[model samples]
Target: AKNIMHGPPPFYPLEDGTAGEQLHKAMKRYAQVPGTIAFTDAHAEVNITYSEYFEMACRLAETMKRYGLGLQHHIAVCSENSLQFFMPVCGALFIGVGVAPTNDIYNERELYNSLSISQPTIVFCSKRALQKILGVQKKLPIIQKIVILDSREDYMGKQSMYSFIESHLPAGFNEYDYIPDSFDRETATALIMNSLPKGVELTHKNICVRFSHCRDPVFGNQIIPDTAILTVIPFHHGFGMFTTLGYLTCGFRIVLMYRFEEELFLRSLQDYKIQSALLVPTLFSFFAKSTLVDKYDLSNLHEIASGGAPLAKEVGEAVAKRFKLPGIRQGYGLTETTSAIIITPEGDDKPGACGKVVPFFSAKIVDLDTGKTLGVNQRGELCVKGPMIMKGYVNNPEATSALIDKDGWLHSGDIAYYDKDGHFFIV
Candidate 1:
C-alpha cells in the first residue's frame, strides 16, 4: 500500500531495543574508551570512561532507589548545564524513574505549574536555583524533598546530591554492578519542559530509534576518530540531548559548554579541533553574520547541524560557504518526536528543504480540509509516523489525540511537501 515512503538508501538500520538497553550495550562496547568530558567552567574538567560513567550512574541510581524513586514515580531537576545536572538524569532513568528536567532560568510560576503537572517525588536543584525552587516549593505537595546538585552545606535538612549519594552508596555497589532494570521501551522516560502545564513525554524507544537513525553509515566521515562536538545548548531541550547523549551513545567525544560565551565557544572549537557541532538556527545565523567566526581557526569543522528552529536558506548557505562546510545543514522535529525526523543528507543540496524523511520514518502530506493524502509537491500538513514519535504529552489526553491519529500517524502542524526526489520542504 506504500504507507511507507522510501527514505534515502538505508545508511544504517534501526535499533531494536530501548534507550537504557542500547546505552548498556554501548557501555560494554566502549567500556575502556573515554566517554564524557564535562566542564564546570572554562578551566575545570571532569573526565570519565564509558565504564566509569556506567558505574557512577548505577551508584547514583541506588541512592535514588532508597529515596523511593522508581517506576511509578518521577523526579524534577532544575539546574544550569553541568555534570551534576546530567548525572542525576541518567541515574533516574536507568533505575526506572522518569526525569523532568527544566532550566534554572525559569521563573517561580513557570516552574510550579509545569512540575506540578509532572507530580514528581523529589526536586534536584543546583545551589544557585534553590531559592527559586523554595519560592514555589510550598505549593507543590507532591515534591517530597529538594536535593541540591552542587551545594556542600545542608540547607533545611536537605543534603546535596554528592553527599546524599556518597553517604548512601550501597555496600556492594561497584562499577560492574549491573543496573537493576529499566521501564518498558514504550514507557515515558522523561518529560520535556513545555510552555504549557504538561510537557511532552518521550519514551525510551523514542530516544533509541532516533539514535539508530543518526548513526547511518553514510555520515561516517562526519563521525570520525578523535571526534569532538561542541555543545552549548541546554540539555533539557531534545536537540541538546541529541547532540550530547545521543552522539555519546555512538562513541562521539562530547565537549560540553556550561553556557554560551561567544569567545569561549570559538576557543573550544579551535582548541578541541571540533569536527562537528549541533547548534540552534539563531546561533547559526549569528555565526553566518558575525566577523568573530573568521578570528578562530575553524578549519577542522566538517559540519554544523542546526535545530530548534528553521534555518533561513541564505543563512545556511552563507555559513557553509564561509566555513567551507558542505552546507549548514538543518533538520526538523519537535519535543514530542524526540528530534530530527527529517534531515539533510550529507551532500544533498536542497536548500529551504528539511532534507528527506530519515531512516525508519515515514511521512505523508495530508490535505487538512478532507484528510486525504496529497501527491508529491502538494503542500499540506506534514504527518510523520515513526517509532521515535513520542508516546504523548504528560497527562494531556486531548492534545495527544489531536497529534496522533488512530492509525498512529503523528500530524505535524507545519505545512510542508516532499518533492519527487523525496526531499521535504516546509512552507
Candidate 2:
C-alpha cells in the first residue's frame, strides 16, 4: 500500500490487464479526452500512468493471493482513505470474493458489528485504525486473521499477519495460481463491485435483493456499463450505486476518490483527466468556497452533476461562473432505490429543476391531506413508481407500509413541485 511494502512491492502488477478491466479502462478511456482525467486524491499527486495503475492493482491482487485469500472471502479495509483502497477492491473482485469495505468513520464498536455480520476470515487494516480495533478485539469473536498494512508491535501484537507471511509462509503461492486469464462478465460481478448496505439495524433484519433495470434507459437510449463516471462519493456508497448494475453490466471503470479533498479533486481532473464528475450540493458549495476556486488548475472539468439534496439555482450559477463549468445539473434518487430513479438528462439547462423524468420513472405531487394531484408549481408530497423502487425496508414493516403502496408507488416523504417546464423540483 506504501511505495513499497518491504524490499519489493507487496503485490506485483499483471503484465496484461487480466485481473481488472475496471482499472484498465479508466486509464484507457481518459487517454484520448483532451482534458478528461480519471483522477482522485488518495495521496499527494499520486498520478500513476494508466498502465502503472492497472499493474499496481494487479500486483496487489497477486500479493493478497500469496497470503491465502480466495473467492467469497470476507476482507475489510479500515483506513481514512489511501491508494491502498483501490488495490484491495480490484483484488477482491479479480479473485472473486465478498469484501466488507466499510466507511473509515466507523468507531470500533460500529466496526465490530459489521465484522460480526460479514464474519470476515481475513482482514487488512491501516495503522491508524489498529489502536481502536485493539480495544474492540475481544468483541470480534470470529476474526481469525489480520493483514496489517504495516507491521508494528502495537499493530500485530504477539502474532502478526506479516510475521506469518515471512516465516511458515504457504509454499507455491503465486498470482498466476489464482489470477484468472480474464474476468467473467456476469459472474456475480454485480455484488463484486458494491459491498453490502450501510444501514444500521437494531433489530434482526433481512435485506431483500432489489434492483433497477440492468441498464438505465434515458429517452429510450440505454445507459451502458461502459459509460464512464467520475465519482467523488465514498466507495462504500459507490458500490451500492455506481458499481453494480451501471458499471458492471456494461464493463466501465470507476475513477475512485481516495478522500474528498478539494485540492486533490481539482488536480485529479488534470492528472487523471476525468469526463463527468458527480457531486452533492454540500460538496459543490465547499468547492465554491475553497481556495482552489481560482488557484487550482481545473480546465479539465466538462459536465458537473449534483443531487442528494436540493441545489440552489444561485449557488449553481456562482459555481458555474467560477469553475467555468455548467451550473449544477440535477440527478435525483435515494439510497433504498439503489441510488437513482428519476435520472437526469445531459445538457438540459433548466436551472433549479431536477432533470426531466426518465422514461422508466413516473411521478405525481399530491396534496398531503386531500389526496388530490397538485397543479403546476404547487407543492405536495412526491410520489414515484419505477422498477428501481425497493420491495420494502430491511425491517420495520409498519414504516415500510406507510412509505410504499400496494400499487408499487414509493412515497418519498419529500415535498416537491413540478415547474411549468415539467422539471420536478424538490423543496
Candidate 3:
C-alpha cells in the first residue's frame, strides 16, 4: 500500500457494547473475585469483594434516578480521586446519564465557565470544592442537586451523598439492575471534557475501544486483577479516564493520588509496590533527576507509561535505565483519538521512536501544503484514521471539519514520519 502502514494484529477482538455496558459486565464478573482490591488512596482503600463497589454504584444509580437523572440529563463531577468520586461516574452511567468531570483544583470563576459550557443538571462535589460551588450556585438554573461526597456533622442539613442514596430507595431497589439497553454506543456521549480549546465529547465507544487498542505483546497480556495501578492524574482529562477505567475493566487494583506532589508519588510507589504507573513528562522529568529514585525500592515497578505531552528523549532513556525497564513505553495521541494512537511496543524499545502504529489504527505522513500523502521516511503532518477516532467535537463542527477530511482521515497537526522499520519519529 502506498504511503500506508498497518500495526500488529490485535490480541483481543474488538469488544461489543457501550462503555457502561462493558463496565457493568466487568464489575459483575470481578465482584466475586475474593481478595481482590478495587481502589486504594494514600490513607484509605476500597477492596473489591469487601467494599461492595458494585452494589454501592447500583444504589447510587437508584438514588440518582429518583432525582430525575436519566439519558437526557448530564451530571457534573468535581473532586479528587476516591472511591466516592468514582462511584457517581459509574452510577450515572448505569442509568445512562452522560458524565462531565471538571478539574477539582479550578477556582470559582474557572469552575463557573466550565459548568456553563457543560450545563449539567446535577453536580457531585467534595467539601474541598464546595466553596466554589457556593460562589456560583445561584447562576445555574439547570443544576437540581448538589450532592456532597462526604458527611457533615449535621446530617439533616448537609444532604451527604451517602444519606441521599440511603433515604431515596426506589421500590424493588434491592433486586433492581440499572442497565439501559437502549444505550447507543456510537452516538451516546460518555464523557464531556471541558476547558480545552473547546469542549470534547467522547462517546461510549470512543473510550471502551481504547482499552482494546492498548494490547501489546511486550507487556505479556491484559492487566490482571492482581496488578496494581496508580491514579495520580485527575479523571477530568482523557488520559486519566482511559488509564483508570481501562485498568478497572481488566480488574486491576487502583491506587489514587489526590495530588501529584513528588514526595507522595515516590512514597506511594515504595509503599504500595505499584506494578505500573502512567505519568506526564513533568513527572518523568522529576524521576529522571530526583535522588528519591535511590531512596525507595522501585523494583516492583515494571511498566512506565507517559502521555499528555511528549517526553524528552533524554528523560525517557534516563528513567528506563534507572528503573531497569525495557524502555519508556511512551506513546503519542490526541484527546480526539480517545487515547494514544502511536505507542512504543513493549519489547521493541527505541530511545526516540514512539513505536509502530497500534493495531486497528492506520497512519500516513502528508505534505502539509500540497495535501499529498508522503512516502515512508518523508516528513509532514501526521494524519490518522481509525474506529477509535472521535465521532466529532461537541457544538464545533467547524473545528471538526478542519481536523477530519472527507475520506475520514484525522489531520493530527504533528510533524512526523515512519522509518523503514516502521518506528514513528516526530520532529
Candidate 4:
C-alpha cells in the first residue's frame, strides 16, 4: 500500500443527480444573474447569455424530442467551436440521448470509422463538414438525418439548424421537464467518441464525478464565475468539451475560437481581458518564444494551464517568465479518465510536475516487468482508480479489459513516477 496514493477525500458528498442534472441545476442558478454572458463567438458576431443559453438548450431539447430523438437514440456532432455546437449537445443530455462528437476536420474515411462505433441516429455538422458527413452517410445507414450547424437556409435538402430550432420555438414550449432519473448512471452512456476511431463511452456517473470536483474549494480548479476565459481547444476533444461546459455551468464566459489562429488568439486574450486559458503545449511554446505576443497587452491574463500533452520544464518556465505568471500549471489524464485526475494546483510551482492526484482518485506506480507496486521515485507504469474512470470503450470489452485491470486500476501506459511529495513526473 506504500506505493499506492490516494487523493484527499471530497469535502462534500457526491450528488445523486446525473451529470446533465447537475449542469441543469448549475445553469439555472447562474441564469438568475440577468444579461450575464455564457459564451462568445470569436469567429462570428454572436454572444449568448446564461438565460438565453439555458432557454435555448431547453427549446432544442423539445425540438429533438419532436424529431423522435429520445433515450433510445444517439446523435453525433462534427463542427468547429460555435454557438450552436453546445445547443444540441446539452439538449441531447436533457433528453437522455447519447452524444458522440467527432473532430470537424476528419476526412470521409476517418468520419466513417469514428461514427461507426456509436452509429448515431442524427448527425449535426458545420457546412465545412457536411460534404464529408454526407459521403459517409451513404455507407452508414444508421445516420438517419443530417443537420447543418451554420446554415440559415436548407442546403441540399438538409435541415438548417436555424429552421430546426425555429420550428419548435414559436409554439412557446416550456423547459423540457422529463429528465429520466431511472437509468443506471454507472452503465448508461452519456457520451461517445471520446477516444475516437474507437468510441470511449463515459457514463453519466463517470462525468458527474468529475463535475463534483468543481464544488470543492480546496481541491477544485476554483473557477470564478463571470470571468472571461479564452477557449482554443477543439470542442470534440474531452478537454475542450467538458471544460467549456463545466465553466459555462459555473457562469464563466467563454470566448471561443474556431481554431488556433496566432493573431486571433492573442487578440482575444487582449480584447476580452481573458482571465484564464487552457492551452496545449505547442501554444505554450509559442507564447514562450513568439515576439508577436509582445505587441498585445496580456496584463489581464492571470492564469495559464497546459494539457492534452506534456509541457517541457524549460518551455513552461519560459512562458512563466515572459508573462510574469506564478507558474504554468500542467494536468495529466486521458479520454478514458474523463478529464484530468492530476493537475498542478494554483500557486504550486514545482517545475515538470503535473501535481498531486485530484480529489476522489487513487494512483500508483507499478513496476512494468514485475507487476508489483513500486515505492516513491520508482519509475514504471502509472495506474489510477476513481469514480471518474470510464465505464469502458464502447462495444470493445476486450480493449477495456486490457486497459483496466481486474482490480479496477486503469493502466496509463505512460512511464512515470511520483516524488515523496506526491507530484507525478512523466518521462
Candidate 5:
C-alpha cells in the first residue's frame, strides 16, 4: 500500500485480525467496493460494485455452462478496457471456460487467422469491435454465439452481452452458489492452472513470454483486499492476466484502461491516490524522458514493478531518479510461465539484471548451445520448472516439443547470463 495514502480504510476485510489467520477472506468484502474505471470514455466513471461485478460474472458463468463452454471451447474478446472487457472474462474463468482475448486492431484477415487457430465457440465484441467482427463473421466458424456489448441501431441482430449476464444470473447469489463443502478458505483459486500441458509449453517455437512460478502457501503472494491497483496493461496479454487473476483473487479493486499514456496515467495516480504500480518499463520512460518530470507530483506510489519486456539499466535508473520509487524493479517471465518470476526487493537492486526467481519457481542457467548447467556468471538459456507453464500449444506438437523437454524444464528462448551474485540478465 502507498505509505502516505489515507482514503482507503486499512486492514482490508480479509485480513483475519486474528492471532494467525488473515483478517478478511470472504467475497462479501467486495460486495459493494468499487472495482475499475475508464475516465477517458463518457461511461468511464462506471464503478462496478463487488456485488454487481460478482453477480455479472456468476450469471455469465452459468450462461457459459448453458452453451457447454468448457475446456473444449474457445472464445475471443477484442475490445478496449472497460466494464465490458472484464465481466465475460471473469465469468468464463469462474466456470472453467477457455477464453482468449485478441487484439482489437486486427483487420478482417488477421482476425480470421486467430479465429482459425482458436476455433472459438463465440467472439465477444463490443460496439467498437462490432465493426471489425462484422467484416469476418461470415467466413469464420461463427461457433455458437457472436456476443456483443451494445444492441443499438448499429447492431440490430447481435446478441447483447448484458443480456446474457442478466438472464442467467444465479438465483439470488448467496452462500449456496459455492460448493456446499467449501468454506471461506474452501473457496480457493489458482490463476491459470499453472501446469502447462505437453505441447503448449514445450514444442512451441516463438511467442512473447513472461516468467512465472507455482503456488505456495508461504510464498503464494496472496493479494490483500485493501490493496486496490490500477491495471494499465491490455487484458489479453499475460501481464494483465497476472494482475486480474492474482490480485483480484484478493478481491482488490482493479482500475481498467485500454491504453496507457503519461498525462492520464500520472493523473490517476493522484486522483485515485494510487499506491502500487503494476507497469511496464515504457511507463516509467515518460517521466524519465521528460524534462518537466517534477511538474506532476506522484509520490503516492509504493511498490512499482515492471514487466512485459526487458528492463534497460538506464531506463530503470531514470525512473528511480524521477519517481523516487522505492520498490522499483522488474519481474521476468513469458506467456507459458503465466508471466511472473523475478521482482525487485525493497532494498538495493543489482543494476541491469532481472531479479531472482520468485518463491514459486526455480531457475537455472545452462550453456547456451550445449545444455550443460552453468554456474555463477555463466551465459546460457534460462530454464524454469513451475506450475505457471502452459499445458501445451493449442495444437502444434512440433512447436511444443521445442519449448518443453522430458524433464519438464520450460526452455526460455531469450539469451541470458547469471551474475556472480546469481542475478540473471536478458540480451
Candidate 6:
C-alpha cells in the first residue's frame, strides 16, 4: 500500500453476460412500464416512450439480421443528436455487431480517416453528413450500405431509417421472442474515436463494468423511471454514449439537445424539470459566470456532474455557491477508461481533489523517469488497471502497447497525485 490504491469492493457485482444481453435485459424490464418516456428531443418536439424505443430497436435489429449483419460485421454512425440516433446503435449491439460513432461535423478527409480504421459494413448518417459519407464511400468500399437518420423517405437511393424498420416488420411480430445474440463479452462492442482518426476498441465487459455503477444503491445516483436528465453532450463520445445508455436502461427520461444552445438548454431544464446533467468544465464555467442563468428557473436540477475534462477548483466552487449546491461533482476519466474511474462521492467535499478511485479499480502514481511507484503527495504519471480499461486501439498495436504496459496497467498521460485519504488531484 505504499503508493498503489485499491477501491472498495463493488457494491453491485457485475454479471456474466455480454453488454448487449445485459442492456437488452435491463431495457426490456423498463419496456413493460407503460407510458414511461425514454427520450425527448428538446428542439424536434419528439417523444419516444420506453415501449416504442424498445420496439424500434428490435425492428432495427431484425432488419440488420435480415441483411446478414452479425458479430463479424461493424457499423458506423454519423449524425447530430436525435431520437433516432440510438436506435441503430442499440440494434447493432443486440446482434453483436460492433458500432463506431463518428462526429457529424467531420469533413470528407476526417470522415475517410475515421471510416478507414473501423471499415464498417454499413454507415448510418444524417442528411447533412450524407454527401461527405458518399465521398468517403468511393475510397473505402467496405461501406456496403448507408441509412439516413432524419429522412422518412429514401434519400438518393439510400434507405431511410423509418423505411428500413417498416420493411423488416413481419406480420404478428413478437417482441418477446426477439433475443439478443450471445457472444463473448471480451470482444469489441464499440470502436470509439477518442482522438480524431484513431479508434479505441472497448469490449462488452468494459462497457458493462461502466454501466454497473449506475445501479449501485450506495452511490445514490441510481437512475429511476421518473427522473429526467438533460443531455447536451454529443453521442459520439464515450462519455455521452454510455451515460445516455445507462439512463435509458434504467428507465430514466432523457431530454436531449441536438447541440448546446444556451437558451434552449436553460429552457429544457426549466420546462422538463430535469433533475440531473452531465456537463463539461466549460459549461460549468458558463453556469457560474453567465448572467443568462438568472433568467431561468433551474431549481429542479439536483445534480451536475462534470467530465470530459477537469474542472478547476474555483470554477466548481463558484458554480456550487451560485446554485447553492453542496458541491460540484467532478469525475476524472478518458475514453480508455470507458468513462469515469474516479468520481467525487456525493457529500464528500475535498476541495481541489477529483475524488477517490471507483470500486473494482486500482490506481497508482509512478515516477516519470524511474518507473517507480510514488507515495502520497508526490506528483507523477497516473496509471490505472481495471475492467473499465479498453481492449486496445483498433489496428494499432504499437500505440496500444505504448499505452498499456505488459503488467496490464493503462498509463494515463496526466500528471497526478493522491493524498493519504486516497483523493486524487490532477495537474
Query: Which whole-number lDDT from 0 to 100 does residue 100 have in model 2?
Result: 59
Q: Of the candidates shown, which would achieve the greatest TM-score relative to the real structure? A: 6
**Residue pairs whose backbone atoms clash in candidate 2:** 12-59, 36-273, 36-274, 37-272, 37-273, 37-274, 38-272, 72-97
Which residue ranges in model 2 land beyond 4 Å of their true spot? 1-42, 47-77, 90-99, 113-123, 148-232, 238-265, 270-274, 295-297, 307-310, 370-377, 390-402, 419-422
TM-score of each: 0.91, 0.64, 0.92, 0.94, 0.78, 0.96
Candidate 6: where are CA atoms >4 Å away?
218-220
Model 3 scores a TM of 0.92
Candidate 5 lDDT by residue in tens digits, 171-251? 565522532111222222212211222212211111111111211222223344455567676666666665555454455
Instruction: Order the numbered candidates by lDDT, best leading.
Output: 6, 4, 3, 1, 5, 2
lDDT (Cα, tens digit) per residue for candidate 6, span 1-427: 6569987776777776887788788778888888889899999878899888888788888889988888788999899988888988888888888899998888778888989988899999999889999999999999999999888899999999878767767777676689988888876565555555578888888878877866654342765548899988888877788778778767889888887887888888889998887775678878888667677788988877754357888898888776667787778888888888888776675888888888888999998988799998999999999988888888889999999999899998899999988899988
Q: Which ten residues in a row have the lowest lDDT in candidate 6?
A: 216-225
Task: Count clashing residue pairs in model 2.
Answer: 8
Q: Write the per-residue lDDT of candidate 4 for residues 302-380, one digit (tens) a residue.
A: 7787543567788888988877787876778888998888877667658888878988899999889777999988899
Model 3, which residues run further than 4 Å from truth? 44-51, 152-158, 175-180, 214-221
Q: Report the lDDT of model 6 for residue 363.
A: 95
lDDT of each: 0.72, 0.51, 0.75, 0.80, 0.55, 0.82
Error (Å) of candidate 6 at residue 134 is 1.2
Encode model 1's per-residue lDDT on 136-192: one tens digit a residue.
778877887888876767766778766787777766766564655645777656545
Give the number of the best model, judged by lDDT.
6
Off by over 4 Å in 5: 1-29, 32-43, 150-154, 166-225, 346-348
